Amino acid sequence: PQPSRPRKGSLGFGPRKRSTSETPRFNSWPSDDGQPGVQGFAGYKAGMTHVVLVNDEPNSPREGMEETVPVTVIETPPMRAVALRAYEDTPYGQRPLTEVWTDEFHSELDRTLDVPEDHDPDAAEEQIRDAHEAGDLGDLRLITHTVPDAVPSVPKKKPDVMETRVGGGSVSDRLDHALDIVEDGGEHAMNDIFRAGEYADVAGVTKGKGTQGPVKRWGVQKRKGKHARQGWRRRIGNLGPWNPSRVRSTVPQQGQTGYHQRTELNKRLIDIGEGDEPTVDGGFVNYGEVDGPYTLVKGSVPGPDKRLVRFRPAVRPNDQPRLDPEVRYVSNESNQG
Amino acid sequence: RECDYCGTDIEPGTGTMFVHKDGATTHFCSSKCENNADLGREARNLEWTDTAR
Amino acid sequence: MEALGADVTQGLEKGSLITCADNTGARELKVISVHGYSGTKNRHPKAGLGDKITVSVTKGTPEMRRQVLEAVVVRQRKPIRRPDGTRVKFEDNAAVIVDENEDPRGTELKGPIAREVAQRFGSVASAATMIV
RNA sequence: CGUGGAAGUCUGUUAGAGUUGGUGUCCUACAAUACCCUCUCGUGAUCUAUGUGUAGGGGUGAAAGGCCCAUCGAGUCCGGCA
RNA sequence: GCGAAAGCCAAGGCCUGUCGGGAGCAACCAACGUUAGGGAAUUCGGCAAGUUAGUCCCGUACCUUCGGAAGAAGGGAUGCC
RNA sequence: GGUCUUAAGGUAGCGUAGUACCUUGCCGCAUCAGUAGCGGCUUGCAUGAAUGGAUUAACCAGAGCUUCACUGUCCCAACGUUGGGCCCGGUGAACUGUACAUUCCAGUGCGGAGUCUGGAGACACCCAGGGGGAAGCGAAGACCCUAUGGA
RNA sequence: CGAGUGGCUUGCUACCUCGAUGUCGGUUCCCUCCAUCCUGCCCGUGCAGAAGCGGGCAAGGGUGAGGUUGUUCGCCUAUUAAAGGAGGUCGUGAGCUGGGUUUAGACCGUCGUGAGACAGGUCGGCUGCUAUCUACUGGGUGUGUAGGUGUCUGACAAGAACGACCGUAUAGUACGAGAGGAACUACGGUUGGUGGCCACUGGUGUACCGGUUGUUCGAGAGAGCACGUGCCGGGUAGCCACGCCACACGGGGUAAGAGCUGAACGCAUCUAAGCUCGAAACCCACUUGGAAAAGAGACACCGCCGAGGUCCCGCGUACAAGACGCGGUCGAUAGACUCGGGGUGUGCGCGUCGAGGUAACGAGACGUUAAGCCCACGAGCACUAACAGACCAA
Ligand SMILES: COc1ccc(C[C@H]2NC[C@H](O)[C@H]2OC(C)=O)cc1
Ligand SMILES: [Cl-]
Ligand SMILES: [Cl-]
Ligand SMILES: [K+]
Ligand SMILES: [Mg+2]
Ligand SMILES: [Mg+2]
Ligand SMILES: [Mg+2]
Ligand SMILES: [Mg+2]
Ligand SMILES: [Mg+2]
Ligand SMILES: [Mg+2]
Ligand SMILES: [Mg+2]
Ligand SMILES: [Mg+2]
Ligand SMILES: [Mg+2]
Ligand SMILES: [Mg+2]
Ligand SMILES: [Mg+2]
Ligand SMILES: [Mg+2]
Ligand SMILES: [Mg+2]
Ligand SMILES: [Mg+2]
Ligand SMILES: [Mg+2]
Ligand SMILES: [Mg+2]
Ligand SMILES: [Mg+2]
Ligand SMILES: [Mg+2]
Ligand SMILES: [Mg+2]
Ligand SMILES: [Mg+2]
Ligand SMILES: [Mg+2]
Ligand SMILES: [Mg+2]
Ligand code: NA
Ligand code: NA
Ligand code: NA
Ligand code: NA
Ligand code: NA
Ligand code: NA
Ligand code: NA
Ligand code: NA
Ligand code: NA
Ligand code: NA
Ligand code: NA
Ligand code: NA
Ligand code: NA
Ligand code: NA
Ligand code: NA
Ligand code: NA
Ligand code: NA
Ligand SMILES: [Sr+2]
Ligand SMILES: [Sr+2]
Ligand SMILES: [Sr+2]
Ligand SMILES: [Sr+2]
Ligand SMILES: [Sr+2]
Ligand SMILES: [Sr+2]
Ligand SMILES: [Sr+2]
Ligand SMILES: [Sr+2]
Ligand SMILES: [Sr+2]
Ligand SMILES: [Sr+2]
Ligand SMILES: [Sr+2]
Ligand SMILES: [Sr+2]
Ligand SMILES: [Sr+2]
Ligand SMILES: [Sr+2]
Ligand SMILES: [Sr+2]
Ligand SMILES: [Sr+2]
Ligand SMILES: [Sr+2]
Ligand SMILES: [Sr+2]
Ligand SMILES: [Sr+2]
Ligand SMILES: [Sr+2]
Ligand SMILES: [Sr+2]
Ligand SMILES: [Sr+2]
Ligand SMILES: [Sr+2]
Ligand SMILES: [Sr+2]
Ligand SMILES: [Sr+2]
Ligand SMILES: [Sr+2]
Ligand SMILES: [Sr+2]
Ligand SMILES: [Sr+2]
Ligand SMILES: [Sr+2]
Ligand SMILES: [Sr+2]
Ligand SMILES: [Sr+2]
Ligand SMILES: [Sr+2]
Ligand SMILES: [Sr+2]
Ligand SMILES: [Sr+2]
Ligand SMILES: [Sr+2]
């Protein structure tokens, strides 16, 4: 009676088209629990290596034993939060109210933005505080950029600007915490937000594969047996039934595959350090040498080497945090071989 | 550990262990060493190998 | 079942001819089904190291031949991954005949066994000469 | 044991003849029957050139209603005929 | 080399099986190479592909019209100096 | 039934057959499982002796089945090679065209609508794609019936 | 016995199509229905337990692999939580297949005087087209909103992004004479699906290095050809799966159901008003798209004689055109060179040895030599090339 089979590919990551921004944009942020703090960071993908680790999990029979774990090295230098945007609760959702900028700007920020020459940080701050008194303040987020100049392997000097939410205690205290970061010069590190052993959500724009067929793009079968020799090898059986007399958008067709934004959940941060400890011999293939602030993410991370990946504390963790894993060995072996 | 074929140190979290019919065990560092062994070649006869030099 | 403590790339399929690593009288075993398995459309049901499989006897003694018995996969050619990242592969594909209570049908086991099979099936371990 | 060298004999893309499968390529074709691989026969009832004979209810046919100039369960042309 | 066989090369002929330029040159198609473990589970059907292979030595079953079956099968050998 | 039609009344053999409706007949072989195949039985819907019966070594691009070997046929797909495909110069057709035409879901209608009715959706143009629809294109249906048609 | 619903079977009719709407079965790919096979939640029991039987809500997900047969159907095997049924022109031939039905060849049986027939069997027996419109998957150019850069909002839109199973502790416990034998909960794993990634394993790798057969360049050295690598062995980057990583909980409101308070009807009553609960199902949560949302959006800064953009040039984290992204001397963007990191496996020449051979000659061995050759990666390095210069724009 012709067997059942789940459909080819997911209908939840659509439409499968080229991403608008290469810089990922989070659609969700964590809950306001503890102390005030920025709800995310960002870095550049370097490559992969393996690490030998001591099993942290109290429920595993292998607790205390040596375990090899795959790791994606991501260079995470200090970023600069140049402003504080505030949102107001309107009957049409959340709309931006005002922004509080600075005086101290990075030498090459004028490659992307039209840097502020004349701004009033006090009138903006006053408008935000009047809104809080009125009970109209939505959420508080920071306009943040990266310093690609600090990373020698990434060719670009032009900063990657992104907005990041501040969550925490009361709305009064986090407004003050946000202003304190900005007023200095905006400099903050991975250490300020993340601790090794916590679960992070990494977002990234995938490796672009251009146009590919239904077999690669949707995971459909190739024509089997005799059918594979008739002139049709990698084409689907039919575009649909007689009725409805149209092709449904749910049928697996050709098109753009890759270069899509993905938000990969519950990625463990194995180690956050600085220096050249995770660098591979001969350099990372198609990237270069690492000698500076880094992060070691458990397993795979979306996007190719040199691409900007975004970090955010896990919005939906399954496991409890087992802080600072004992890193017995980090491989430095050549990736060429 | 050390490669039972060439003699170089097997990088941890890498390699393959071949279990022979009699129960004997052979740790290999790479595919190159496995393939040379399958050709009936003995490690000490090949100049690139650490056992030979 | 209980965790093996190793990632297995199932090297056998339904219909595969494997060795019977024991003295039951059965020499060659043919895989029929894999316990607790449910595949997907067009996929050949796969068996690997540590799996309890339903088997038929292809070669052996007259009384043992043609019988439909249960067995446990002890060795396989396709590699398995141990927690330390190292891969472990065998010379042949082998299984030991087992009963309803998971105790080996024979008395002696021929050739090596993987430590993961030994941990899962206890009475098969306390019959194993070599555990690699 | 040797000699001898028979055969609608065997192997063979020798030349040559044939045309099994791919239901591949082509299918407004290179081609109104093509291309490629595969396959059969290849000293005989063999293949082949040229010359010559048999003519339409008639030939020719190891017979398929096959073939008789892309035309065949009765060729083609023109006429009967508007 | 058994060879009017293959492959390679002369003599002789040709670059006229007569449109070119560009993109590591994507999907898809035609021809095709290689694919771990499994090994016909594919399909009406092993269709397609593959396996085997030359030569010498050993050896060779049922059946048979005594001709044959038969290169049955199976086993070994093979270069250079 | 223990002759009658219409002369005789099926002998050797073979037999569930490329002939057996029942039918996947029953038993056995083989397989985990075999409407297959082979053997045996066989009352044969409706076998049978030059309408030739049976049998058979050799032969076969003939039909069916089993085994060893082999393998991308499959699990389940990947990467590569060559020619296209895509962009540029030059050359340059055809098929097809009542009109209108951005459609979709329902309905209605000669009962199988892009065009009617109600709603929904819909800014224009262009490139590439695989072919869902135009009961797509191609052919005055070969089937069937009809004609005081033909051969 | 009576009353119906459906439109899957069959039959009936002859409305539509005979200037043609291509068959059955299969396949592939998409959507759907519920009369639910499993999974969630429930009621009853001839419900001790365990395992069942029967019924209700419920279509989120799942419902698989094989042997005979063209088969659909069905029979059979082993697995499984279960291996449900049905619609979409008996979905699907401008997608495939062509085994069956149903052309022309042939045989057998039956019937026929015969040609020939058969709702009998059997062997063989072809699969056309360059997409105009529409539809959808992806990619651009314009116009609208009405100078630019960067950051956002969220009307709507899509999702199964998760489904299911095994095991351990609970526990040899509750229950039961015994046999037998649970659960809540907490854990570990497997399977199917999903998205992404290549450190590891594996494949490829007509880059590259080596071995070697035949032939040609006289030998040597070094090379060409042998199908687009002669063959064999190894294999970097990349691309990949057979490899690796990630994919909740919880809220809210309900269905079946369990109840509370409560009247009509002084009592009773889960319901009539009101209320507490309660499904894998619904909404939220989470992921993806989304200023063309015509109410055509918001914020900050820059600018209107100049902000910004295009062309150009060197290149890819991008790519079929177009698009996208980066660098452009205040520079490491690309190449050369040199290192580093890698592949192969020890170069030519020379020396010694070498079975023998008068000698000539001599396959080959050792040394020189971790040699020679090679690199789609990295670093250093402005040597070379990113020069020169043009245009638009409130
Ligand atoms: C299965 O037996 C069949 C019988 C007839 C047809 C064709 C007819 N059906 C639709 C039209 O009446 C006609 O279409 C055509 C001729 O193209 C197809 C199969
Ligand atoms: Cl197919
Ligand atoms: Cl199974
Ligand atoms: K018709
Ligand atoms: Mg690598
Ligand atoms: Mg390695
Ligand atoms: Mg199938
Ligand atoms: Mg003549
Ligand atoms: Mg005839
Ligand atoms: Mg293979
Ligand atoms: Mg099948
Ligand atoms: Mg063949
Ligand atoms: Mg019989
Ligand atoms: Mg007679
Ligand atoms: Mg007609
Ligand atoms: Mg007729
Ligand atoms: Mg007549
Ligand atoms: Mg049609
Ligand atoms: Mg119901
Ligand atoms: Mg559904
Ligand atoms: Mg149909
Ligand atoms: Mg169609
Ligand atoms: Mg067709
Ligand atoms: Mg076509
Ligand atoms: Mg047939
Ligand atoms: Mg037939
Ligand atoms: Na074709
Ligand atoms: Na159709
Ligand atoms: Na004689
Ligand atoms: Na032919
Ligand atoms: Na013949
Ligand atoms: Na005539
Ligand atoms: Na007769
Ligand atoms: Na292939
Ligand atoms: Na179409
Ligand atoms: Na009815
Ligand atoms: Na069909
Ligand atoms: Na359901
Ligand atoms: Na079946
Ligand atoms: Na139809
Ligand atoms: Na069909
Ligand atoms: Na067709
Ligand atoms: Na709920
Ligand atoms: Sr954002
Ligand atoms: Sr959003
Ligand atoms: Sr075809
Ligand atoms: Sr329609
Ligand atoms: Sr002959
Ligand atoms: Sr011949
Ligand atoms: Sr044919
Ligand atoms: Sr052609
Ligand atoms: Sr043709
Ligand atoms: Sr072929
Ligand atoms: Sr006339
Ligand atoms: Sr010449
Ligand atoms: Sr010309
Ligand atoms: Sr190779
Ligand atoms: Sr088969
Ligand atoms: Sr089969
Ligand atoms: Sr031999
Ligand atoms: Sr008789
Ligand atoms: Sr096309
Ligand atoms: Sr319902
Ligand atoms: Sr149920
Ligand atoms: Sr049917
Ligand atoms: Sr039947
Ligand atoms: Sr169907
Ligand atoms: Sr046919
Ligand atoms: Sr039939
Ligand atoms: Sr008659
Ligand atoms: Sr018939
Ligand atoms: Sr207008
Ligand atoms: Sr239990
Ligand atoms: Sr007990
Ligand atoms: Sr060549
Ligand atoms: Sr060969
Ligand atoms: Sr209720
Ligand atoms: Sr707008």
Side-chain angles (χ1 to χ4, degrees):
Chain A
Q2 207 178 110
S4 301
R5 165 211 50 142
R7 63 162 283 112
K8 309 301 195 192
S10 171
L11 247 19
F13 301 86
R16 250 80 163 200
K17 56 169 280 180
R18 286 169 195 175
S19 192
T20 297
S21 305
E22 193 175 291
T23 292
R25 311 295 171 170
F26 285 111
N27 78 120
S28 180
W29 295 108
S31 55
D32 308 304
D33 283 359
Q35 290 184 281
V38 195
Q39 292 179 307
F41 203 72
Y44 293 94
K45 188 175 172 177
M48 291 185 89
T49 7
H50 58 278
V51 62
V52 183
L53 235 64
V54 173
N55 193 261
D56 293 69
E57 206 161 46
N59 299 297
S60 172
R62 289 192 57 79
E63 189 184 17
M65 291 184 223
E66 301 242 86
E67 203 170 278
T68 307
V69 167
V71 122
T72 301
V73 182
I74 289 157
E75 291 207 69
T76 45
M79 291 197 311
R80 284 168 199 206
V82 284
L84 178 267
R85 183 172 263 161
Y87 287 73
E88 62 154 336
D89 288 330
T90 69
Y92 308 106
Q94 288 189 329
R95 288 193 190 191
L97 223 178
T98 358
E99 284 167 57
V100 183
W101 288 71
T102 41
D103 301 82
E104 278 180 50
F105 293 114
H106 184 249
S107 62
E108 279 166 320
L109 181 56
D110 65 323
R111 284 180 169 258
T112 326
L113 306 175
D114 278 330
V115 179
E117 291 186 79
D118 285 285
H119 181 59
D120 192 348
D122 303 286
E125 194 176 327
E126 202 185 303
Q127 202 172 67
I128 298 169
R129 293 192 127 110
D130 280 325
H132 183 12
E133 284 174 46
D136 287 323
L137 195 67
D139 73 323
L140 300 146
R141 316 201 205 160
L142 303 168
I143 307 292
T144 318
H145 79 268
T146 57
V147 182
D149 216 20
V151 199
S153 305
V154 180
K156 73 181 183 181
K157 296 148 198 169
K158 179 180 172 79
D160 289 322
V161 193
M162 61 276 260
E163 211 181 285
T164 312
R165 198 183 178 257
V166 186
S170 65
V171 259
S172 294
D173 281 314
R174 69 163 159 274
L175 210 174
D176 284 297
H177 178 71
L179 287 160
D180 282 325
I181 302 163
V182 180
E183 301 295 274
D184 297 324
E187 200 171 305
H188 57 298
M190 188 76 174
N191 294 311
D192 296 20
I193 305 150
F194 297 99
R195 173 111 102 111
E198 289 176 317
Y199 288 109
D201 291 339
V202 187
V205 170
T206 60
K207 300 184 80 168
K209 280 136 207 307
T211 39
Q212 305 288 320
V215 183
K216 180 161 179 67
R217 194 179 197 236
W218 295 95
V220 316
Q221 289 192 356
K222 293 205 308 171
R223 297 253 177 147
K224 299 300 165 182
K226 195 168 253 182
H227 309 301
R229 283 180 266 119
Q230 315 310 304
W232 292 265
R233 291 184 186 276
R234 328 191 100 242
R235 298 173 182 180
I236 63 165
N238 62 269
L239 294 165
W242 193 317
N243 277 292
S245 299
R246 52 187 177 87
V247 176
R248 252 192 273 256
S249 65
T250 57
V251 323
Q253 292 194 76
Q254 160 256 66
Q256 249 286 323
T257 128
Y259 206 74
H260 308 135
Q261 185 190 288
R262 288 292 179 267
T263 302
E264 236 169 299
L265 279 32
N266 306 336
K267 297 269 145 179
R268 199 181 192 221
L269 302 176
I270 297 304
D271 186 23
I272 303 169
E274 185 163 348
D276 72 319
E277 284 91 271
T279 318
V280 155
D281 285 338
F284 282 100
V285 194
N286 287 299
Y287 186 73
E289 300 174 324
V290 176
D291 194 21
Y294 67 90
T295 306
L296 297 189
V297 172
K298 192 196 174 180
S300 49
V301 149
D305 304 334
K306 292 170 181 188
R307 217 193 283 311
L308 178 90
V309 298
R310 274 239 265 177
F311 293 95
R312 162 238 265 178
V315 296
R316 44 178 286 194
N318 287 323
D319 302 309
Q320 204 59 59
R322 290 127 54 221
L323 308 168
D324 299 85
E326 197 191 300
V327 179
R328 290 226 189 121
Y329 181 67
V330 178
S331 191
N332 288 299
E333 189 186 36
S334 178
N335 283 347
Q336 305 179 69
Chain B
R1 271 195 162 277
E2 199 168 87
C3 182
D4 299 331
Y5 194 75
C6 82
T8 54
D9 295 325
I10 304 180
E11 169 72 43
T14 291
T16 316
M17 192 213 299
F18 182 67
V19 187
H20 299 254
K21 197 182 177 181
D22 55 14
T25 273
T26 312
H27 289 80
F28 287 106
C29 84
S30 59
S31 58
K32 187 189 183 180
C33 288
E34 296 182 57
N35 293 313
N36 278 83
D38 286 352
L39 287 173
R41 297 170 167 164
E42 302 178 326
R44 51 184 30 147
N45 299 322
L46 299 183
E47 281 194 74
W48 55 273
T49 267
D50 270 6
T51 306
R53 42 146 127 127
Chain C
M1 289 193 271
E2 194 168 274
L4 274 188
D7 281 52
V8 186
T9 301
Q10 291 103 137
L12 313 178
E13 297 193 320
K14 171 179 185 83
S16 299
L17 296 180
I18 60 176
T19 310
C20 193
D22 60 24
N23 58 358
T24 50
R27 297 185 184 177
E28 192 180 66
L29 289 186
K30 179 198 288 170
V31 189
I32 294 177
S33 297
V34 184
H35 193 83
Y37 189 84
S38 177
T40 194
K41 191 197 167 187
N42 301 329
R43 185 173 285 177
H44 299 359
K46 56 184 185 191
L49 192 125
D51 283 314
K52 188 167 70 176
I53 56 162
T54 303
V55 193
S56 78
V57 183
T58 303
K59 292 173 178 180
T61 55
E63 297 279 309
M64 280 302 277
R65 263 189 265 117
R66 285 204 49 73
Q67 280 196 70
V68 178
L69 308 166
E70 288 184 64
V72 165
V73 195
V74 149
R75 298 192 292 271
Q76 71 167 51
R77 282 190 179 101
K78 190 68 192 166
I80 66 162
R81 185 179 57 88
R82 281 204 166 142
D84 76 316
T86 309
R87 309 293 173 163
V88 183
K89 61 178 182 180
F90 300 80
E91 185 269 330
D92 73 328
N93 304 299
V96 168
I97 301 174
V98 120
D99 71 4
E100 192 181 71
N101 300 313
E102 295 177 340
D103 304 315
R105 193 190 159 99
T107 336
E108 301 163 343
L109 305 192
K110 304 174 179 177
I113 291 205
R115 66 162 92 126
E116 290 91 7
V117 186
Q119 188 223 129
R120 189 178 266 191
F121 301 99
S123 50
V124 176
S126 52
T129 317
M130 293 155 266
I131 286 169
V132 188

